[PDB]
């Protein structure tokens, strides 16, 4: 196997392929990238027995077909350390790979390519192309609500649902829920799948904001994503995701509208002195008035008051400041609408002018 390439054309695809790899792999082979030269094409593959990433590069110079496996981090460092605009020539000699760049020579150990695991082929069920912007919006909206480590595994992922001409992303962890939906302009059959945390992370990373459309294929238990010359394949978690519709309040009688920035600043100031162990705050809502209070076992109390658009009866309700701050950070809008019924019922948070994204927060016992 012999080929020659440019540093610029190889720096980015190599970084994308080697990004997922890290730590100590289950097997040494999983810690290496598979390089294949064939029909004037260089294919870089990286997998960890749960997901696969494939990148392709065009060759316009003499080359020899072949296949090998090489270390990821060391090869990436060697490629990055060379001067900009240099030419990298890769050759295979015995059980070694020789990399040449001007007067710089490197010899790297290799392993047989036959030992590299390969995922079995599968047939897709629903195929659809959408702009990267919509996927980025959905991910940034619904990522923060996923659970970190729970016995219920299906809550650790994100629920992607195709309904009519709409795509919806839902996340929850048993205490808070985030839902978003966007149109796609094409009719697709009703379907629902669960994506794991690592898959969502990789899908978010691979997006670059470019004009290249993202093509998504969903099958029985696998999902494939095409973006330019990058292909990402992942598996689907098995389970029954809870229905989000029942979570939403049926009839929230009391409504409130508040400035996002001022409310967020007030919440942060209240949380500065709030109990670190609990991070709990107490809200007193009255006619055109919202008061936030916090306290700690050291008898230090923090109080703040602000003016809002409210017309209901006075109420007292406890909350966890972390969830509210996360929701406010997610919603980047001038005004935020909060709908609630009582102190022991879930509160719904939405944008004043946009209803695409909604959040549900369960109040804390206080």
């Amino acid at each position: 196997m012999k080929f020659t390439v440019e540093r610029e054309h190889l720096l980015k695809p190599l970084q994308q392929v080697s990004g997922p790899l890290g730590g100590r792999p289950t097997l040494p082979i999983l810690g290496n990238l598979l390089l294949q030269v064939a029909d004037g094409t260089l294919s870089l593959t990286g997998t960890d027995l749960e997901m696969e990433m494939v990148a392709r590069v065009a060759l316009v110079q003499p080359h020899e077909p072949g296949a090998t496996t090489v270390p990821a981090r060391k090869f990436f460092d060697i490629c990055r350390g060379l001067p900009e605009g240099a030419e990298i020539a890769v050759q295979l000699e015995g059980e070694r790979m020789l990399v040449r760049s001007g007067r710089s020579r490197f010899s790297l150990s290799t392993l047989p390519a036959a030992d590299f695991p390969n995922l079995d082929d599968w047939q897709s069920e629903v195929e659809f192309t959408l702009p990267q912007a919509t996927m980025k919006r959905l991910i940034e909206a619904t990522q923060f609500s996923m659970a970190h480590q729970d016995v219920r595994y299906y809550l650790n992922g994100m629920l992607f649902e195709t309904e009519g001409e709409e795509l919806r992303t839902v996340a929850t962890d048993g205490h808070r829920l985030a839902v978003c939906s966007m149109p796609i302009g094409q009719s697709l059959p009703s379907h629902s799948v669960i994506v794991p945390r690592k898959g969502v992370i990789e899908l978010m990373r691979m997006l670059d904001g470019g004009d290249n459309p993202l093509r998504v294929q969903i099958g029985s238990n696998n999902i494939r994503a095409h973006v330019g010359d990058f292909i990402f394949t992942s598996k689907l978690v098995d389970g029954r995701f809870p229905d989000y519709r029942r979570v939403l309040p049926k009839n929230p009688d009391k409504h409130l509208e508040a400035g996002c920035d001022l409310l967020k600043q007030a919440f942060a100031r209240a949380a500065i002195l709030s109990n670190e162990k609990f991070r709990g705050v107490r809200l007193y809502v009255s006619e055109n008035q919202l008061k936030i209070t916090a306290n700690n076992p050291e008898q230090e109390e923090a109080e703040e008051i602000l003016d809002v658009t409210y017309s209901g009866a006075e109420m007292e309700i406890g909350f966890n400041v972390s969830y509210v701050l996360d929701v406010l950070n997610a919603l980047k809008c001038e005004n935020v609408r909060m709908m609630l019924t009582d102190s022991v019922s879930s509160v719904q948070i939405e944008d004043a002018a946009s209803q695409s994204a909604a959040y549900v927060v369960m109040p804390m016992r206080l």
Binding site: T172, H175, K277, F278, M362
Partner: protein, 343 residues
């Protein structure tokens, strides 16, 4: 605070479900059975969420407090389980438990497992806070006198027939180990679908006689069965049973025998057994030794036991098995040279 036994726990649960349940004792089998019954009843009532934590100095009480305070969108009716330290709660654990009891909700079902609490442990703020809304089930291993009743009941609830000889054999082979006895009963039921468990069947099952029963060797010594005692000692040596355990058991029995022998010169043996609360099944074999070994014996035996115990405490020698065999023949009616006793 209600107080119950494992048998009445099912009836209490059928009558109703209380906010908190306390499981204090030293019998893992009964505690596990009570926990399983309580969890099954709670799941029937609609408790599909369960949480368990271990109490220790390096404990994250913040997570427990957050779970108690935090609500659930759909998975309500939470269940929490605590495992107390073997020593028992301390002042820090006492105040942590008091705080946890302060933060209690109707949808949270609390279960606690640990050893029996002493008077000082019982007299705690958290313990008194739950007095009006708690039921404690006592779960401890029954003594040998009450063992055959439990064995018969367990066989009956499994739809099995046990003979008196089979029951006695099972009690003798698995005294103080109810888990092993239950496993043996289950294996016997598997072996014989008809469910008829005659004495030969259990005797064939007893062929295993894995280990951990030096009391059998000590009883053989007490009965004067030189052949049986020697055989059991050889089997224990093959099994690698801790010689220190054999030494301690024989030490307890030999001290009791020495006291009885010395104080029986003016009192009947049976009266002394009653004074010491000895078990009639033991009283027999003990009496045989007390009617088989003179005062010269049980003194050379005491000397040998003390020397071996000192050697194992200071030298930790592995030749203790030969000394145990010598002491075994000494405990029998064998004269012995008295030179092997280092005398």
């Amino acid at each position: 605070m209600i107080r119950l036994y494992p048998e009445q726990l099912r009836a209490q649960l059928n009558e109703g479900l209380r906010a908190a349940y306390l499981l204090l004792g030293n019998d893992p089998l009964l505690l596990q059975e009570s926990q399983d019954a309580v969890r099954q009843v709670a799941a029937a009532q609609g408790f599909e969420e369960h949480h368990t934590f271990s109490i220790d100095p390096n404990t994250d009480w913040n997570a427990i407090f957050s779970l108690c305070q935090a609500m659930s969108l759909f998975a309500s009716r939470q269940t929490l389980l605590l495992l107390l330290p073997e020593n028992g709660p301390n002042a820090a654990i006492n105040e942590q438990l008091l705080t946890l009891t302060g933060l209690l909700h109707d949808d949270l079902l609390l279960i606690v497992r640990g050893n029996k609490l002493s008077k000082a442990q019982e007299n705690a703020a958290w313990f008194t806070a739950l007095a009006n809304r708690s039921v404690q089930v006592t779960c401890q291993t029954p003594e040998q006198a009450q063992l055959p009743r439990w064995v018969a009941a367990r066989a009956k609830q499994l739809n099995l027939e046990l003979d008196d000889a089979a029951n006695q054999v099972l009690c003798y082979c698995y005294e103080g180990n109810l888990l092993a006895l239950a496993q043996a009963l289950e294996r016997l039921s598997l072996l014989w679908p008809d469910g008829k468990l005659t004495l030969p069947r259990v005797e064939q099952a007893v062929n295993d006689a894995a280990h951990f029963t030096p009391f059998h060797w000590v009883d053989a010594l007490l009965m004067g069965k030189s052949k049986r005692a020697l055989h059991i000692l050889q089997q224990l040596r093959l099994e690698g049973s801790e010689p220190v355990i054999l030494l301690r058991t024989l030490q307890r029995e030999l001290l009791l025998l020495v006291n009885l022998k010395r104080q029986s010169a003016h009192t009947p043996l049976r009266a002394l057994f009653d004074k010491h609360r000895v078990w009639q099944n033991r009283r027999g074999m003990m009496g045989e030794a007390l009617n088989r070994l003179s005062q010269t014996q049980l003194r050379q035996a005491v000397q040998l036991l003390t020397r071996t115990e000192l050697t194992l405490k200071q030298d930790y020698g592995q030749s203790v098995w030969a000394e145990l065999e010598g002491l075994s023949l000494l405990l029998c009616h064998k004269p012995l040279a008295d030179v092997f006793i280092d005398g």
